[PDB]
């Protein structure tokens, strides 16, 4: 029960989903042909939450892959771990938005939204009990942002009761892969604060930093970053698919991490992170993982938490451990970081422990921080957009695709309102 439907938009979303479903299949011991050959009944007891068992004991991922270009879908169908997908799921157009949010939300999206919603409704009726949706996309490409916003709007208009998760790759401050990404980022963020339950902002800057420094890799490819994000997601949901001395679900996290409906943006963090040689030079201690999770260099969002305060903190542990040890860690870390938390929330740590570890390691930990520093990030983006809107550069594309300047005005206004709210609540005593 409590099945979760996976949706992927944007090229980055598709690559992340490819690696993520690879990880999931490996965890449940599912071959690329889709047959289970594992040895632990635990995997099969909750396999339904992510898979569907077709006859002859075949298993298919309950996933949807969406784009507007055939290249990425063709690549996915080409490589291994692509056969198990239902071949009818690959919805794709022919043009590709081309970093034009208006195209990805007005013209092209209006063509494939019908098929997307049809497949979504089919999947919804196919499952027993719907828990929520998790979305994968970008915020720079027009495809990702535009079509993701459109689908989120339609779905929320169709399911006001379900919980919605989004893993949006926020563009990095320093490095920008595009030229016009501030516009679409602003519009997509507007729609997200409109109709989303939680957003896991992630930057390629922070991921590159972690891969280069912590993992000691001079050549980080997209595969490595996608693998990291996949591990993060699997750790997020594993409290559902496995027993634990203190389990959590998406609803519990939503209640714990969202004090007020607007402030629902998080940052993730994973531990441990060890190189190929630097692994047997350390004891795997709950204190070690706890201290690893809390530091500037290990945050997947390019924003120093020291510049702000933590509104809420959640932690999910995997592998056997004693509760008392974790409790001691939490109390010690809250004692030493007394200046790093909001005052009006006592005991702002939400703990959860599973009982199955991440493949070959002995234990692991995932940290989800809802802090206030992230507003700084937004600030910068607005400034970028601000400059790029003062001269109205590149405006004519969106203008001739139906959008108007009032749209950008309202989007910037809403973003500034959100930043003001975040700053004000940081200053709350």
């Amino acid at each position: 029960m409590r099945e979760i439907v996976h949706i992927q938009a944007g090229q980055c979303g598709n690559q992340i989903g490819a690696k993520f479903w690879e990880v999931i299949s490996d965890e449940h011991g599912i071959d690329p042909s889709g047959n289970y050959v594992g040895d632990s009944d635990l995997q099969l007891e909750r396999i339904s939450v992510y898979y569907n068992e077709a006859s002859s004991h075949k298993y298919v991922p309950r996933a949807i892959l969406v784009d507007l270009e055939p290249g990425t879908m063709d690549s996915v169908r080409s490589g291994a771990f692509g056969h198990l997908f239902r071949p009818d799921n690959f919805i794709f157009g022919q043009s590709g938005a081309g970093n034009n949010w208006a195209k990805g939300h007005y013209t092209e999206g209006a063509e494939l939204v019908d098929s997307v919603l049809d497949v979504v409704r089919k999947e919804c009726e196919n499952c027993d009990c719907l828990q929520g949706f998790q979305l994968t996309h970008s915020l720079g490409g027009g495809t990702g942002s535009g079509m993701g916003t459109l689908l989120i709007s339609k779905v929320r208009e169709e399911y006001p009761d379900r919980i919605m998760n989004t893993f949006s790759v926020v563009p990095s401050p320093k490095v920008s892969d595009t030229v016009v990404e501030p516009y679409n980022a602003t519009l997509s963020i507007h729609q997200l604060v409109e109709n989303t339950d939680e957003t896991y902002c992630i930057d390629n800057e922070a991921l590159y930093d972690i891969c280069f420094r912590t993992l000691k890799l001079a050549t980080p490819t997209y595969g490595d970053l996608n693998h990291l994000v996949s591990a993060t997601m699997s750790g997020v949901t594993t409290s559902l698919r496995f027993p634990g001395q203190l389990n959590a679900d998406l609803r519990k996290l939503a209640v714990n991490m969202v004090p007020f409906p607007r402030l629902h943006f998080f940052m993730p963090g994973f531990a441990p992170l060890t190189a190929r040689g630097s692994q047997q030079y350390r004891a795997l201690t709950v204190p070690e993982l706890t201290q690893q999770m809390f530091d500037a260099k290990n945050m997947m969002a390019a924003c120093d938490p020291r510049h702000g305060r933590y509104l809420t903190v959640a932690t999910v542990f995997r592998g056997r451990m004693s509760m008392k040890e974790v409790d001691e860690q939490m109390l010690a870390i809250q004692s030493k970081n007394s200046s790093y938390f909001v005052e009006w929330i006592p005991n702002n740590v939400k703990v959860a422990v599973c009982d199955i570890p991440p493949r070959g390691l002995k234990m692991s930990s995932t940290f989800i921080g809802n802090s206030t520093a992230i507003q700084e990030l937004f600030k910068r983006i607005s400034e970028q957009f601000t400059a790029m809107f003062r001269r109205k550069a590149f405006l004519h594309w969106y203008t001739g695709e139906g959008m108007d300047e009032m749209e950008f005005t309202e989007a910037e206004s809403n973003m500034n309102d959100l930043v003001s709210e975040y700053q004000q609540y940081q200053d709350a005593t």
Binding site: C129, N247, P259, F260
Partner: protein, 432 residues
């Protein structure tokens, strides 16, 4: 002839019940298959065969824990009739577990309760096991206790509530759940037992020398407490005691019925020797505040009432001598208007060690139930937290959208203040 039924809400309740029924089976020599290669009549019913089943009820909204119980060792023992499961857990949201989701199966639970009651003749009371942090705990406890108190006018009702620790928390909205569920249970609970995880952690680490204890050990301890409480009914003693005796001896006023539990002896297996375990010795161990299972030093308050249940080979003369000596002490101070604050019960059956456990078998054991005024202080702390988390109106929107009013929060806070005021006011001495 004297039957008492169990209810388990939330994961904490289910695990506690696992430990409890494990212990009871070990006591009456009951196989996991209801066979025993009268005594058991209180808790176990007997089928046509030599198989017995426990008068237990398990309820939860997350089916994972119940599935674990079904796949656990104690599979064949339970009756799959009672293992009630839901679909989505209350998720630390009292509103979900008290207005939205609990309605889905409240009728089913009530039906099972009534069917079990009709097949019993000496129905004594209800043992409700539930935490406070979990929304399942608070919401379903409130709902079910209200329903049962509505149904049965005057029958014993006992709760084993996992009071949230002062500092070591797991959830974030624990103050809300705790305040709401306490405001609810204040009117229905005949007698509720506060237990905190932090105190048991301390006890296990310091006294049993277990540096990294798991939830299993805490469940073992609480199961021991429950077994010692009911041993008077389940067996014969030189001086037995019933639950109605407890409620008559520990409730000076209708509202003040929140005692705490303590157990002794608790020594590591390697420390089984090196002490003779005197009845006076175990008495001192019980009354030592380092062994009380709630984070409150009784030296800041007065014991309004105390009850001691001894089991094993004990003799009332030395027991009375030890108690009299205890009375002669100063820091152990009661109310002036109460001349004697001790109830004594004795059972001939010594406790039995849990196989694969951590404790060591003894010949004498003692459980203490104390209703004091120090515990009052604990409530204040929670209110403190609540106030802060209510000053900014944080997290309120979830409950609001689930069908709850802020006036409910205000009135619950007012009722908590009223209870604390009553506790403090009774704590004072009498005029002349």
């Amino acid at each position: 002839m004297r039957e008492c039924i169990s209810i388990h809400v939330g994961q904490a309740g289910v695990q506690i019940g696992n430990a409890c029924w494990e212990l009871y089976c070990l006591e009456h020599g009951i196989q996991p298959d209801g066979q025993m290669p009268d005594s058991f009549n209180t808790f176990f019913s007997e089928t046509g065969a030599g198989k017995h089943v426990p008068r237990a009820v398990f309820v939860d909204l997350e089916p994972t824990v119940i599935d674990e119980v079904r796949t656990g060792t104690y599979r064949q023992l339970f009756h799959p009739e009672q293992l009630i499961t839901g679909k989505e857990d209350a998720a630390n949201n009292y509103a979900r577990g008290h207005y939205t989701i609990g309605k889905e199966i409240i009728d089913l639970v009530l039906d099972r309760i009534r069917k079990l009651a009709d097949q019993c003749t000496g129905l004594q009371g209800f043992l409700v096991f539930h935490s406070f942090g979990g929304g399942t705990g608070s919401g379903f406890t409130s709902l079910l206790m209200e329903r049962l108190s509505v149904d049965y006018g005057k029958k014993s009702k006992l709760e084993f509530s996992i009071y949230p620790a002062p500092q070591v928390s797991t959830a974030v909205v624990e103050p809300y759940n705790s305040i709401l569920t306490t405001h609810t249970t204040l009117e229905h609970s005949d007698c509720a037992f506060m237990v905190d995880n932090e105190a048991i952690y301390d006890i296990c680490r310091r006294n049993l020398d277990i540096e990294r204890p798991t939830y299993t050990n805490l469940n073992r301890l609480i199961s021991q407490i429950v077994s010692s409480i009911t041993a008077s009914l389940r067996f014969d003693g030189a001086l037995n005691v019933d639950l109605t005796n407890f409620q008559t001896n520990l409730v000076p006023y209708p509202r003040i019925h929140f005692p705490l539990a303590t157990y002794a002896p608790v020594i590591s297996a390697e420390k089984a020797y090196h002490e003779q375990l005197s009845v006076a010795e175990i008495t001192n161990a019980c009354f030592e505040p380092a062994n009380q299972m709630v984070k409150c030093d009784p030296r800041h308050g007065k014991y309004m009432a105390c009850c001691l249940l001894y089991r094993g080979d004990v003799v009332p003369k030395d027991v009375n001598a030890a108690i009299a000596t205890i009375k002669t002490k100063r820091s152990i101070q009661f109310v002036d208007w109460c001349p004697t604050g001790f109830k004594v019960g004795i059972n001939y059956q010594p406790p039995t060690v849990v196989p694969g456990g951590d404790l060591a078998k003894v010949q004498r054991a003692v459980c203490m139930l104390s209703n004091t005024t120090a515990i009052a202080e604990a409530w204040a702390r929670l209110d403190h937290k609540f106030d802060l988390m209510y000053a900014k109106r944080a997290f309120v929107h979830w409950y609001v959208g689930e069908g709850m009013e802020e006036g409910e929060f205000s009135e619950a806070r007012e009722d908590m203040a009223a209870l604390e005021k009553d506790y403090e006011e009774v704590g004072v001495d009498s005029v002349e």
